[PDB]
Protein backbone atom coordinates (compact mmCIF):
# COMPACT_ATOMS: atom_id res chain seq x y z
CA UNK A 1 0.00 0.00 0.00
CA UNK A 2 2.86 2.50 0.24
CA UNK A 3 2.65 2.72 -3.55
CA UNK A 4 -1.08 3.45 -3.26
CA UNK A 5 -0.49 6.02 -0.51
CA UNK A 6 2.13 7.79 -2.62
CA UNK A 7 -0.13 7.76 -5.68
CA UNK A 8 -3.08 9.14 -3.70
CA UNK A 9 -0.95 11.89 -2.17
CA UNK A 10 0.46 12.86 -5.57
CA UNK A 11 -3.01 12.82 -7.12
CA UNK A 12 -4.27 15.19 -4.42
CA UNK A 13 -1.29 17.51 -4.97
CA UNK A 14 -1.93 17.66 -8.72
CA UNK A 15 -5.64 18.32 -8.17
CA UNK A 16 -4.94 21.14 -5.71
CA UNK A 17 -2.49 22.76 -8.13
CA UNK A 18 -5.03 22.25 -10.92
CA UNK A 19 -7.76 23.94 -8.88
CA UNK A 20 -11.45 23.24 -8.52
CA UNK A 21 -14.60 24.46 -10.25
CA UNK A 22 -18.02 25.29 -8.80
CA UNK A 23 -19.23 21.68 -8.86
CA UNK A 24 -16.02 20.26 -7.37
CA UNK A 25 -15.94 22.89 -4.61
CA UNK A 26 -19.57 22.17 -3.73
CA UNK A 27 -18.89 18.42 -3.58
CA UNK A 28 -15.76 19.00 -1.50
CA UNK A 29 -17.70 21.14 0.98
CA UNK A 30 -20.24 18.35 1.48
CA UNK A 31 -17.50 15.78 2.08
CA UNK A 32 -15.56 18.08 4.42
CA UNK A 33 -18.66 18.83 6.49
CA UNK A 34 -19.54 15.13 6.71
CA UNK A 35 -16.03 14.12 7.79
CA UNK A 36 -15.78 16.88 10.40
CA UNK A 37 -19.19 16.07 11.91
CA UNK A 38 -18.89 12.28 11.96
CA UNK A 39 -15.13 11.80 12.44
CA UNK A 40 -13.10 14.82 13.54
CA UNK A 41 -15.59 16.35 15.99
CA UNK A 42 -17.12 13.07 17.21
CA UNK A 43 -15.82 10.41 19.58
CA UNK A 44 -15.44 7.40 17.29
CA UNK A 45 -15.74 5.00 20.23
CA UNK A 46 -19.45 5.86 20.61
CA UNK A 47 -20.57 3.98 17.49
CA UNK A 48 -22.47 0.71 17.81
CA UNK A 49 -20.55 -1.96 15.91
CA UNK A 50 -16.89 -2.78 16.44
CA UNK A 51 -16.21 -2.77 12.69
CA UNK A 52 -17.40 0.81 12.23
CA UNK A 53 -15.64 1.97 15.40
CA UNK A 54 -12.35 0.53 14.17
CA UNK A 55 -12.59 1.85 10.61
CA UNK A 56 -13.93 5.22 11.76
CA UNK A 57 -10.87 5.60 14.00
CA UNK A 58 -8.59 4.61 11.12
CA UNK A 59 -10.14 7.43 9.11
CA UNK A 60 -9.81 9.75 12.11
CA UNK A 61 -6.17 8.78 12.66
CA UNK A 62 -5.46 9.21 8.94
CA UNK A 63 -7.05 12.66 9.07
CA UNK A 64 -4.94 13.65 12.07
CA UNK A 65 -1.66 12.83 10.33
CA UNK A 66 -2.64 14.23 6.93
CA UNK A 67 -4.30 17.45 8.17
CA UNK A 68 -3.75 18.25 11.85
CA UNK A 69 -0.09 17.23 12.10
CA UNK A 70 0.76 18.63 8.66
CA UNK A 71 -0.99 21.93 9.47
CA UNK A 72 0.87 22.17 12.79
CA UNK A 73 4.18 21.66 11.00
CA UNK A 74 3.38 24.28 8.38
CA UNK A 75 1.89 26.61 10.98
CA UNK A 76 4.94 26.17 13.17
CA UNK A 77 7.25 26.78 10.21
CA UNK A 78 5.52 30.08 9.47
CA UNK A 79 5.63 30.98 13.17
CA UNK A 80 9.32 30.10 13.37
CA UNK A 81 10.06 32.31 10.35
CA UNK A 82 8.22 35.20 12.02
CA UNK A 83 9.99 34.39 15.29
CA UNK A 84 13.37 34.67 13.56
CA UNK A 85 12.28 37.98 12.02
CA UNK A 86 11.21 39.45 15.37
CA UNK A 87 14.33 38.16 17.13
CA UNK A 88 16.52 39.93 14.57
CA UNK A 89 14.40 43.08 14.77
CA UNK A 90 14.52 43.26 18.58
CA UNK A 91 17.96 41.62 18.99
CA UNK A 92 16.51 39.42 21.74
CA UNK A 93 14.26 36.41 22.32
CA UNK A 94 10.53 37.05 21.88
CA UNK A 95 7.87 34.52 22.86
CA UNK A 96 4.62 36.15 21.71
CA UNK A 97 4.73 35.09 18.01
CA UNK A 98 5.03 31.37 18.82
CA UNK A 99 1.45 30.88 20.15
CA UNK A 100 -0.34 33.60 18.18
CA UNK A 101 1.33 33.05 14.81
CA UNK A 102 1.29 29.27 15.19
CA UNK A 103 -2.46 29.36 15.76
CA UNK A 104 -2.94 31.67 12.76
CA UNK A 105 -0.82 29.42 10.55
CA UNK A 106 -2.74 26.33 11.65
CA UNK A 107 -6.05 28.04 10.88
CA UNK A 108 -4.75 29.05 7.44
CA UNK A 109 -3.27 25.67 6.50
CA UNK A 110 -5.97 23.38 7.91
CA UNK A 111 -8.62 24.33 5.29
CA UNK A 112 -6.23 23.86 2.36
CA UNK A 113 -5.01 20.44 3.48
CA UNK A 114 -8.58 19.41 4.34
CA UNK A 115 -9.65 20.49 0.85
CA UNK A 116 -6.68 18.68 -0.69
CA UNK A 117 -7.49 15.31 0.92
CA UNK A 118 -11.25 15.65 1.48
CA UNK A 119 -12.05 12.83 -0.96
CA UNK A 120 -9.72 10.33 0.72
CA UNK A 121 -11.25 10.89 4.16
CA UNK A 122 -14.77 10.55 2.77
CA UNK A 123 -13.98 7.30 0.94
CA UNK A 124 -12.37 5.65 3.98
CA UNK A 125 -15.75 5.80 5.78
CA UNK A 126 -17.42 3.37 3.33
CA UNK A 127 -17.91 0.69 5.97
CA UNK A 128 -21.15 -0.48 4.34
CA UNK A 129 -24.86 0.30 4.21
CA UNK A 130 -25.45 -2.11 7.12
CA UNK A 131 -24.12 0.49 9.58
CA UNK A 132 -25.21 4.00 10.51
CA UNK A 133 -21.87 5.56 9.54
CA UNK A 134 -21.87 3.77 6.18
CA UNK A 135 -25.50 4.66 5.47
CA UNK A 136 -24.83 8.35 6.08
CA UNK A 137 -21.67 8.00 4.01
CA UNK A 138 -23.70 6.54 1.14
CA UNK A 139 -26.32 9.30 1.40
CA UNK A 140 -23.68 12.02 1.00
CA UNK A 141 -22.06 10.07 -1.84
CA UNK A 142 -25.34 9.98 -3.77
CA UNK A 143 -25.76 13.73 -3.28
CA UNK A 144 -22.20 14.37 -4.46
CA UNK A 145 -22.73 12.09 -7.46
CA UNK A 146 -25.89 14.02 -8.36
CA UNK A 147 -24.07 17.35 -8.05
CA UNK A 148 -21.06 16.19 -10.08
CA UNK A 149 -23.15 14.18 -12.59
CA UNK A 150 -20.75 11.23 -12.17
CA UNK A 151 -20.49 8.00 -10.19
CA UNK A 152 -17.94 7.30 -7.46
CA UNK A 153 -17.24 4.44 -5.07
CA UNK B 1 22.64 -21.48 39.51
CA UNK B 2 24.41 -23.72 37.00
CA UNK B 3 24.94 -26.33 39.71
CA UNK B 4 21.25 -26.35 40.61
CA UNK B 5 20.31 -26.49 36.92
CA UNK B 6 22.67 -29.43 36.34
CA UNK B 7 21.28 -31.26 39.37
CA UNK B 8 17.77 -30.83 37.98
CA UNK B 9 18.96 -32.18 34.62
CA UNK B 10 20.52 -35.21 36.32
CA UNK B 11 17.36 -35.85 38.33
CA UNK B 12 15.18 -35.69 35.20
CA UNK B 13 17.39 -36.99 32.40
CA UNK B 14 20.36 -39.04 33.70
CA UNK B 15 19.26 -41.21 36.64
CA UNK B 16 15.80 -42.19 35.27
CA UNK B 17 17.47 -43.49 32.10
CA UNK B 18 18.70 -46.51 34.10
CA UNK B 19 15.38 -47.45 35.73
CA UNK B 20 14.22 -49.48 32.70
CA UNK B 21 16.67 -51.33 30.46
CA UNK B 22 14.85 -54.56 29.49
CA UNK B 23 11.39 -55.49 28.20
CA UNK B 24 8.81 -55.50 30.99
CA UNK B 25 6.00 -58.04 31.26
CA UNK B 26 3.51 -55.92 33.24
CA UNK B 27 2.59 -52.31 32.46
CA UNK B 28 5.72 -51.70 30.40
CA UNK B 29 4.23 -48.62 28.72
CA UNK B 30 2.99 -47.19 32.02
CA UNK B 31 6.42 -47.57 33.63
CA UNK B 32 8.22 -46.14 30.60
CA UNK B 33 5.80 -43.20 30.43
CA UNK B 34 6.32 -42.54 34.15
CA UNK B 35 10.02 -41.80 33.66
CA UNK B 36 9.45 -39.94 30.38
CA UNK B 37 6.93 -37.51 31.89
CA UNK B 38 9.38 -35.86 34.29
CA UNK B 39 11.84 -35.19 31.46
CA UNK B 40 9.52 -34.22 28.59
CA UNK B 41 7.27 -31.87 30.62
CA UNK B 42 9.91 -29.53 32.06
CA UNK B 43 8.73 -25.92 32.34
CA UNK B 44 11.76 -24.79 30.32
CA UNK B 45 10.03 -25.61 27.01
CA UNK B 46 6.42 -25.51 28.28
CA UNK B 47 6.05 -22.20 30.11
CA UNK B 48 5.56 -19.03 28.10
CA UNK B 49 2.20 -19.28 26.34
CA UNK B 50 0.63 -17.46 29.30
CA UNK B 51 2.74 -14.41 28.32
CA UNK B 52 2.71 -15.01 24.56
CA UNK B 53 1.69 -11.39 23.92
CA UNK B 54 5.28 -10.33 24.68
CA UNK B 55 6.26 -11.50 21.19
CA UNK B 56 2.98 -12.23 19.39
CA UNK B 57 1.08 -9.26 17.98
CA UNK B 58 -2.75 -9.30 18.01
CA UNK B 59 -3.15 -10.61 14.46
CA UNK B 60 -0.09 -12.83 14.87
CA UNK B 61 -1.51 -14.09 18.16
CA UNK B 62 -4.78 -15.05 16.47
CA UNK B 63 -2.99 -16.97 13.72
CA UNK B 64 -0.67 -18.64 16.24
CA UNK B 65 -3.66 -19.52 18.44
CA UNK B 66 -5.16 -21.74 15.74
CA UNK B 67 -1.70 -23.03 14.84
CA UNK B 68 -1.10 -24.06 18.44
CA UNK B 69 -4.48 -25.74 18.84
CA UNK B 70 -3.89 -27.82 15.71
CA UNK B 71 -0.31 -28.63 16.72
CA UNK B 72 -1.23 -29.79 20.23
CA UNK B 73 -4.41 -31.60 19.16
CA UNK B 74 -3.12 -35.06 20.08
CA UNK B 75 -4.82 -36.06 23.37
CA UNK B 76 -1.89 -38.26 24.46
CA UNK B 77 0.57 -35.42 25.08
CA UNK B 78 1.66 -34.61 28.65
CA UNK B 79 3.35 -31.43 27.40
CA UNK B 80 0.03 -30.11 26.11
CA UNK B 81 -1.48 -30.92 29.51
CA UNK B 82 1.10 -28.68 31.21
CA UNK B 83 0.97 -26.00 28.50
CA UNK B 84 -1.13 -22.90 29.09
CA UNK B 85 -4.46 -22.84 27.28
CA UNK B 86 -4.75 -21.44 23.76
CA UNK B 87 -8.47 -20.67 24.29
CA UNK B 88 -8.02 -17.04 25.29
CA UNK B 89 -8.03 -13.57 23.76
CA UNK B 90 -5.11 -11.21 23.31
CA UNK B 91 -4.89 -9.06 26.43
CA UNK B 92 -4.23 -5.90 24.39
CA UNK B 93 -6.79 -6.26 21.59
CA UNK B 94 -8.59 -9.19 19.97
CA UNK B 95 -9.72 -8.99 16.34
CA UNK B 96 -10.98 -12.50 15.48
CA UNK B 97 -12.42 -14.10 18.64
CA UNK B 98 -15.20 -12.11 20.31
CA UNK B 99 -16.03 -14.58 23.10
CA UNK B 100 -13.92 -17.48 24.37
CA UNK B 101 -15.60 -20.83 23.77
CA UNK B 102 -18.19 -19.46 21.31
CA UNK B 103 -16.91 -21.43 18.33
CA UNK B 104 -18.37 -23.33 15.39
CA UNK B 105 -15.98 -26.28 15.83
CA UNK B 106 -14.67 -27.82 19.03
CA UNK B 107 -11.07 -27.81 17.73
CA UNK B 108 -10.78 -24.76 15.47
CA UNK B 109 -10.75 -21.51 17.50
CA UNK B 110 -12.74 -19.63 14.85
CA UNK C 1 6.53 -19.02 -11.11
CA UNK C 2 3.50 -21.27 -10.61
CA UNK C 3 1.48 -19.57 -13.31
CA UNK C 4 0.99 -15.87 -12.68
CA UNK C 5 1.41 -16.64 -8.96
CA UNK C 6 5.01 -15.58 -8.25
CA UNK C 7 6.00 -18.09 -5.57
CA UNK C 8 9.59 -16.83 -5.23
CA UNK C 9 10.19 -15.89 -1.60
CA UNK C 10 13.68 -14.34 -1.83
CA UNK C 11 14.54 -11.24 -3.88
CA UNK C 12 17.80 -10.29 -2.18
CA UNK C 13 20.10 -8.15 -4.32
CA UNK C 14 23.87 -8.37 -4.76
CA UNK C 15 24.65 -6.26 -1.66
CA UNK C 16 21.85 -7.51 0.59
CA UNK C 17 22.45 -6.85 4.29
CA UNK C 18 19.26 -8.21 5.84
CA UNK C 19 17.58 -11.59 5.81
CA UNK C 20 17.10 -13.22 2.43
CA UNK C 21 13.32 -13.39 2.89
CA UNK C 22 10.89 -11.90 5.41
CA UNK C 23 7.81 -13.97 4.54
CA UNK C 24 8.58 -16.62 7.16
CA UNK C 25 7.11 -15.86 10.57
CA UNK C 26 10.35 -16.97 12.25
CA UNK C 27 12.45 -14.41 10.37
CA UNK C 28 9.88 -11.66 10.99
CA UNK C 29 10.13 -12.28 14.74
CA UNK C 30 13.93 -12.32 14.56
CA UNK C 31 13.97 -9.14 12.47
CA UNK C 32 11.67 -7.36 14.91
CA UNK C 33 13.66 -8.61 17.91
CA UNK C 34 16.99 -7.48 16.44
CA UNK C 35 15.68 -4.01 15.56
CA UNK C 36 14.53 -3.37 19.12
CA UNK C 37 17.67 -4.99 20.56
CA UNK C 38 19.63 -2.00 19.25
CA UNK C 39 16.93 0.40 20.47
CA UNK C 40 17.52 -0.31 24.18
CA UNK C 41 21.00 1.23 24.32
CA UNK C 42 20.30 4.97 24.57
CA UNK C 43 21.63 5.53 28.09
CA UNK C 44 24.62 3.21 27.70
CA UNK C 45 25.77 4.73 24.41
CA UNK C 46 25.48 8.28 25.75
CA UNK C 47 27.41 7.31 28.89
CA UNK C 48 30.30 5.87 26.88
CA UNK C 49 30.37 9.01 24.72
CA UNK C 50 30.93 11.27 27.73
CA UNK C 51 33.61 9.12 29.39
CA UNK C 52 35.38 8.90 26.02
CA UNK C 53 35.10 12.67 25.64
CA UNK C 54 36.27 13.36 29.20
CA UNK C 55 39.30 11.06 29.01
CA UNK C 56 40.38 12.39 25.61
CA UNK C 57 40.06 16.04 26.75
CA UNK C 58 41.31 16.30 30.36
CA UNK C 59 42.90 13.05 31.58
CA UNK C 60 46.11 13.48 29.55
CA UNK C 61 49.20 14.51 31.51
CA UNK C 62 49.15 17.84 29.67
CA UNK C 63 45.71 18.95 30.86
CA UNK C 64 44.62 17.46 34.20
CA UNK C 65 46.28 14.30 35.54
CA UNK C 66 44.87 13.02 38.82
CA UNK C 67 46.97 11.62 41.66
CA UNK C 68 45.53 8.11 42.03
CA UNK C 69 46.18 7.42 45.72
CA UNK C 70 43.82 4.44 45.92
CA UNK C 71 45.77 1.31 46.84
CA UNK C 72 43.29 -1.52 46.26
CA UNK C 73 39.74 -1.90 44.95
CA UNK C 74 36.83 -2.16 47.37
CA UNK C 75 33.94 -3.16 45.10
CA UNK C 76 31.69 -5.82 46.61
CA UNK C 77 28.46 -5.81 44.59
CA UNK C 78 29.18 -3.70 41.51
CA UNK C 79 29.27 -6.91 39.47
CA UNK C 80 25.70 -7.75 40.48
CA UNK C 81 24.50 -4.21 39.71
CA UNK C 82 26.23 -4.15 36.32
CA UNK C 83 24.92 -7.60 35.34
CA UNK C 84 21.34 -6.29 35.17
CA UNK C 85 21.94 -5.20 31.57
CA UNK C 86 23.28 -8.59 30.33
CA UNK C 87 20.60 -10.24 32.47
CA UNK C 88 17.94 -8.34 30.51
CA UNK C 89 19.69 -9.45 27.32
CA UNK C 90 19.44 -13.09 28.39
CA UNK C 91 15.78 -12.67 29.34
CA UNK C 92 14.98 -11.10 25.97
CA UNK C 93 16.87 -13.83 24.11
CA UNK C 94 15.16 -16.60 26.09
CA UNK C 95 11.71 -15.05 25.72
CA UNK C 96 11.96 -14.46 21.98
CA UNK C 97 13.67 -17.80 21.36
CA UNK C 98 11.15 -19.82 23.37
CA UNK C 99 8.12 -18.16 21.76
CA UNK C 100 9.46 -19.21 18.35
CA UNK C 101 10.22 -22.71 19.65
CA UNK D 1 18.22 7.77 40.08
CA UNK D 2 21.13 5.93 41.68
CA UNK D 3 23.40 7.25 44.41
CA UNK D 4 20.75 9.73 45.56
CA UNK D 5 18.68 6.92 47.11
CA UNK D 6 21.68 6.00 49.30
CA UNK D 7 22.39 7.97 52.47
CA UNK D 8 26.03 6.79 52.39
CA UNK D 9 27.02 7.85 48.88
CA UNK D 10 30.74 7.29 49.44
CA UNK D 11 29.90 3.68 50.32
CA UNK D 12 27.76 3.47 47.17
CA UNK D 13 30.79 4.34 45.04
CA UNK D 14 33.28 2.31 47.09
CA UNK D 15 31.08 -0.78 47.24
CA UNK D 16 30.38 -0.93 43.50
CA UNK D 17 33.80 -0.37 41.89
CA UNK D 18 35.76 2.14 44.01
CA UNK D 19 35.62 4.29 40.86
CA UNK D 20 33.82 7.58 40.24
CA UNK D 21 32.08 8.08 36.89
CA UNK D 22 28.98 9.78 38.31
CA UNK D 23 29.58 13.04 36.44
CA UNK D 24 29.47 11.36 33.03
CA UNK D 25 26.67 9.03 34.14
CA UNK D 26 24.41 11.88 35.29
CA UNK D 27 25.27 14.09 32.30
CA UNK D 28 24.37 11.26 29.91
CA UNK D 29 20.70 11.36 30.94
CA UNK D 30 20.10 14.61 29.06
CA UNK D 31 21.50 13.25 25.80
CA UNK D 32 19.82 9.88 26.35
CA UNK D 33 16.44 11.63 26.71
CA UNK D 34 16.27 12.49 22.99
CA UNK D 35 18.78 10.26 21.16
CA UNK D 36 16.12 7.53 20.86
CA UNK D 37 13.17 9.39 19.32
CA UNK D 38 13.95 8.71 15.63
CA UNK D 39 14.55 5.04 16.44
CA UNK D 40 11.33 4.81 18.47
CA UNK D 41 9.15 6.49 15.85
CA UNK D 42 10.53 4.41 12.98
CA UNK D 43 9.98 1.30 15.09
CA UNK D 44 6.33 2.28 15.53
CA UNK D 45 6.04 2.47 11.75
CA UNK D 46 7.86 -0.86 11.45
CA UNK D 47 5.62 -2.51 14.05
CA UNK D 48 2.53 -1.32 12.20
CA UNK D 49 3.94 -2.78 8.98
CA UNK D 50 4.32 -6.14 10.74
CA UNK D 51 0.78 -5.86 12.12
CA UNK D 52 -0.64 -5.16 8.66
CA UNK E 1 -50.95 -19.05 9.39
CA UNK E 2 -48.71 -21.83 8.09
CA UNK E 3 -50.17 -24.49 5.76
CA UNK E 4 -49.43 -27.24 8.33
CA UNK E 5 -46.93 -28.76 5.87
CA UNK E 6 -44.37 -25.95 5.61
CA UNK E 7 -40.94 -27.27 4.67
CA UNK E 8 -42.30 -30.42 2.99
CA UNK E 9 -40.86 -31.11 -0.45
CA UNK E 10 -43.70 -31.22 -3.01
CA UNK E 11 -43.99 -34.55 -4.80
CA UNK E 12 -41.99 -34.51 -8.02
CA UNK E 13 -40.34 -31.22 -7.08
CA UNK E 14 -37.52 -30.26 -9.45
CA UNK E 15 -34.70 -27.91 -8.45
CA UNK E 16 -35.17 -25.56 -11.40
CA UNK E 17 -35.62 -21.78 -11.58
CA UNK E 18 -35.99 -21.33 -15.34
CA UNK E 19 -38.88 -18.86 -15.11
CA UNK E 20 -38.36 -17.41 -11.64
CA UNK E 21 -38.65 -13.68 -10.94
CA UNK E 22 -35.45 -12.64 -9.16
CA UNK E 23 -36.71 -9.10 -8.46
CA UNK E 24 -38.33 -10.29 -5.21
CA UNK E 25 -34.94 -11.19 -3.69
CA UNK E 26 -33.38 -7.74 -4.19
CA UNK E 27 -34.12 -6.59 -0.63
CA UNK E 28 -32.67 -9.80 0.87
CA UNK E 29 -29.06 -8.89 0.02
CA UNK E 30 -26.99 -5.69 0.17
CA UNK E 31 -24.29 -4.75 -2.33
CA UNK E 32 -21.68 -2.07 -1.68
CA UNK E 33 -21.07 0.85 -4.01
CA UNK E 34 -17.85 -0.79 -5.26
CA UNK E 35 -19.55 -4.03 -6.33
CA UNK E 36 -18.47 -3.50 -9.94
CA UNK E 37 -14.84 -2.99 -8.95
CA UNK E 38 -14.94 -6.03 -6.65
CA UNK E 39 -16.37 -8.13 -9.48
CA UNK E 40 -13.46 -7.29 -11.79
CA UNK E 41 -10.92 -7.81 -9.00
CA UNK E 42 -12.46 -11.20 -8.20
CA UNK E 43 -12.22 -12.22 -11.85
CA UNK E 44 -8.67 -10.87 -12.17
CA UNK E 45 -7.40 -12.62 -9.05
CA UNK E 46 -9.04 -15.96 -9.86
CA UNK E 47 -7.69 -16.02 -13.42
CA UNK E 48 -4.14 -15.15 -12.31
CA UNK E 49 -4.22 -17.46 -9.26
CA UNK E 50 -6.12 -20.61 -10.26
Amino acid sequence: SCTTRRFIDEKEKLEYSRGYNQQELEASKLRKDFVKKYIVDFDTTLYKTQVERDWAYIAKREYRYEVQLKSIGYGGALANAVLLWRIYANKKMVFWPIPIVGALGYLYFQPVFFQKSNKRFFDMCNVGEEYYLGRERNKILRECNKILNVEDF
Amino acid sequence: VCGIYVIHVIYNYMIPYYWVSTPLKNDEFTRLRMKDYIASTVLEEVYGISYAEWGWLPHDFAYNRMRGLAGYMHPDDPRAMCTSTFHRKHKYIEHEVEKVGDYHHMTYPK
Amino acid sequence: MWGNLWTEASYQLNFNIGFSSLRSDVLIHLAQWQYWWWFWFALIWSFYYFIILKVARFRVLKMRPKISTSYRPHGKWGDFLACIIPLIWCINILTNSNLIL
Amino acid sequence: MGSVWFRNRYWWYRSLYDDYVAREAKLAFGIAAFIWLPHYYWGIHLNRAFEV
Amino acid sequence: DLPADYGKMPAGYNFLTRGKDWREYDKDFILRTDAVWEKFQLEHFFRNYM
Partner: peptide, 20 residues
Protein backbone atom coordinates in the same frame (compact mmCIF):
# COMPACT_ATOMS: atom_id res chain seq x y z
CA UNK F 1 9.91 -9.31 27.29
CA UNK F 2 7.47 -7.02 29.11
CA UNK F 3 7.63 -4.06 26.69
CA UNK F 4 10.60 -4.99 24.52
CA UNK F 5 8.68 -4.14 21.34
CA UNK F 6 7.96 -0.75 22.99
CA UNK F 7 4.70 -0.30 21.03
CA UNK F 8 1.70 -2.20 19.69
CA UNK F 9 -0.43 -1.05 16.75
CA UNK F 10 -3.81 -2.11 18.09
CA UNK F 11 -5.41 0.46 15.77
CA UNK F 12 -4.75 -1.73 12.70
CA UNK F 13 -8.02 -3.70 12.52
CA UNK F 14 -8.87 -6.99 10.87
CA UNK F 15 -9.40 -6.36 7.17
CA UNK F 16 -13.11 -6.26 6.37
CA UNK F 17 -14.31 -8.60 3.64
CA UNK F 18 -15.67 -6.58 0.71
CA UNK F 19 -16.89 -9.36 -1.57
CA UNK F 20 -20.35 -8.82 -3.14
Amino acid sequence: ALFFMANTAISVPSVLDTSP
